[PDB]
Structures are given as C-alpha cells and as structure tokens.
Amino acid sequence: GRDLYDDMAESQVERFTFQAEINQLMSLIINTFYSNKEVFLRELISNASDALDKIRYQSLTDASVLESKTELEIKIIPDKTAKTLTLIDSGIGMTKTDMVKNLGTIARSGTKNFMEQLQSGAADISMIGQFGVGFYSAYLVADTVIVHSKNNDDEQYVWESSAGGEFTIALDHTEPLGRGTKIVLHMKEDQLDYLDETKIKNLVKKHSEFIQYPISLLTIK
C-alpha cells in the first residue's frame, strides 16, 4: 500500500496548496488525539526503503546512477537540543516536480476512504501506510516537517510545511546530500520522548526487521 516513490542571501520560494483531501487528512492527523503514534517511524523507514529499492533496481539496468553516492543506507539522528528527529536515505531522491506532485498537490486514491475508515473505526492510525498516505503520519509527532531531496535529474530542493493548507519549495543550499532524501521532524513538545536514546533505539529495531539496508543510529551527547 506504500507508494510514495511509485511511478545578503537571496532565495526564490514557491508556495503550493495541498489537494483538498490531503489537507483534510493533515487536519485529522493534527487535531485528533491518538494514543499510539509509533507508526510515524515505521513510515519514515519504509518510505526510505522504497526509495533505496528504486535506485538499486535502476542501477541493475544503468550502473552509472550510483556515481552520485555509492552507499545505499539509512541514517537516523535524534537531536534533543534541536528538538528534531532526522532520517536520511541515499535512495532515488525527488526532483522539484516530484515533490510538488508527490508531497501534496496531486490527489491520492486512498485518502478519502482512509479518513472514512478512521472516523468509523474500521481502521486505526497504524494502518495509514496501507492507504498510500503514510508520509503524512509525520504530523502525528511533528509541528513542522522539512524534506530536503536530491535526485540525479535535478538540483537539491527543500520542501517545508507546518500544515495550514500550504507548503513551500525552494532551492536548497544547505549540506549537499549527493543523492537521496533528508526528512527533518520538528517534534511537538508532548512527543519529545521519541528522542530518548533507548526509546528510539527500540523503535528503530522494532520497525526495521525486514529492511535490507544498513541503518546508522546517532545519539548526541
């Protein structure tokens, strides 16, 4: 059901509006109480794995695609001072238009039906990935989500949203990724426990049993 990757300083920033049902979903995720929000980490890792698969399989038929970053790996960085959780993958990455389309402007087939099932009790929040909208689970635990991405076909871009119906995209001149995606979750005050060393270690272990890529987990001292 996961399909995110399926087929003086001056800055130019473009603003976009979320597709109506995606906007509704984000509001539902933010303005409703959920007891168990661990799915957010499952989705971060699984989406990273999909991105890694996509570039790995593209490399079978075109080996040159890995020249931008030869490693296929995941890095997870909890940072209590910054109040952020970051997950970096060296997967396929997203061009600017990939971000525009896949991170909010284009309708997703499962959004309406997912929201109906949440309202009824037929589904719970842990099942979000099955409905192809798992990315948005980040808003269970984060006020703001920032997505830096670099695809071989484009320059590095950064997408940002604090919900409220809109997102922005701009050229990204921060640390070059080489290739892949860095997602930064600015954690809500009441969700900071997810940055605790043992808590995040256990969660990563729990949600990576079948992941076929190396994971590096940092602790900041």
Side-chain angles (χ1 to χ4, degrees), residues 86-106:
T86 300
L87 190 149
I88 306 171
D89 70 74
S90 55
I92 191 149
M94 289 177 272
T95 68
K96 176 183 171 285
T97 63
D98 289 336
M99 296 184 151
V100 173
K101 293 178 290 185
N102 299 346
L103 302 175
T105 65
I106 302 297

Side-chain angles (χ1 to χ4, degrees), residues 7-74 76-108 110-111 113-118 120-174 176-198 200-211:
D7 286 348
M8 189 189 59
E10 297 170 59
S11 177
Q12 304 276 332
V13 182
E14 190 170 7
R15 267 209 306 266
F16 298 85
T17 305
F18 285 112
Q19 194 275 336
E21 282 81 62
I22 295 176
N23 184 48
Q24 288 170 19
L25 175 68
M26 294 178 73
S27 297
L28 189 62
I29 285 170
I30 294 161
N31 307 141
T32 306
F33 174 83
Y34 302 97
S35 182
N36 183 2
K37 293 176 159 184
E38 72 177 326
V39 67
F40 88 91
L41 187 66
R42 189 191 182 202
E43 298 311 306
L44 279 168
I45 293 170
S46 65
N47 287 340
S49 181
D50 288 351
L52 286 158
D53 282 352
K54 200 173 187 183
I55 195 71
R56 183 173 58 84
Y57 283 107
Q58 286 185 20
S59 81
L60 298 194
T61 51
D62 185 356
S64 73
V65 304
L66 299 177
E67 291 172 344
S68 52
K69 188 160 226 71
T70 312
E71 300 86 2
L72 300 170
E73 62 178 332
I74 295 164
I76 302 176
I77 313 105
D79 189 331
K80 288 189 168 184
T81 304
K83 291 175 181 167
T84 58
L85 181 66
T86 300
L87 190 149
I88 306 171
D89 70 74
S90 55
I92 191 149
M94 289 177 272
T95 68
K96 176 183 171 285
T97 63
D98 289 336
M99 296 184 151
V100 173
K101 293 178 290 185
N102 299 346
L103 302 175
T105 65
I106 302 297
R108 312 270 91 155
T111 315
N113 286 121
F114 183 53
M115 293 185 292
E116 289 180 340
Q117 295 193 30
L118 276 179
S120 73
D124 71 268
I125 195 66
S126 76
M127 298 169 181
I128 189 171
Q130 288 183 261
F131 292 78
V133 287
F135 168 77
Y136 298 96
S137 68
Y139 290 92
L140 291 164
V141 300
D143 290 314
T144 301
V145 175
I146 319 282
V147 181
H148 305 250
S149 200
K150 176 71 176 69
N151 180 285
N152 291 337
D153 285 345
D154 206 356
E155 292 308 308
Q156 191 163 311
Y157 280 87
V158 60
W159 175 106
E160 176 179 348
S161 183
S162 297
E166 58 195 30
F167 67 89
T168 61
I169 299 169
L171 279 162
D172 183 17
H173 302 297
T174 69
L177 295 174
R179 191 197 54 253
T181 299
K182 169 168 75 169
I183 304 185
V184 184
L185 274 54
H186 290 266
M187 301 298 286
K188 293 171 192 189
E189 201 69 19
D190 63 359
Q191 304 299 331
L192 290 172
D193 290 340
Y194 284 120
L195 305 184
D196 283 355
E197 178 177 5
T198 314
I200 192 63
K201 173 181 178 164
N202 288 343
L203 279 163
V204 171
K205 286 179 175 322
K206 181 174 177 179
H207 295 290
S208 66
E209 190 186 359
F210 310 107
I211 303 291

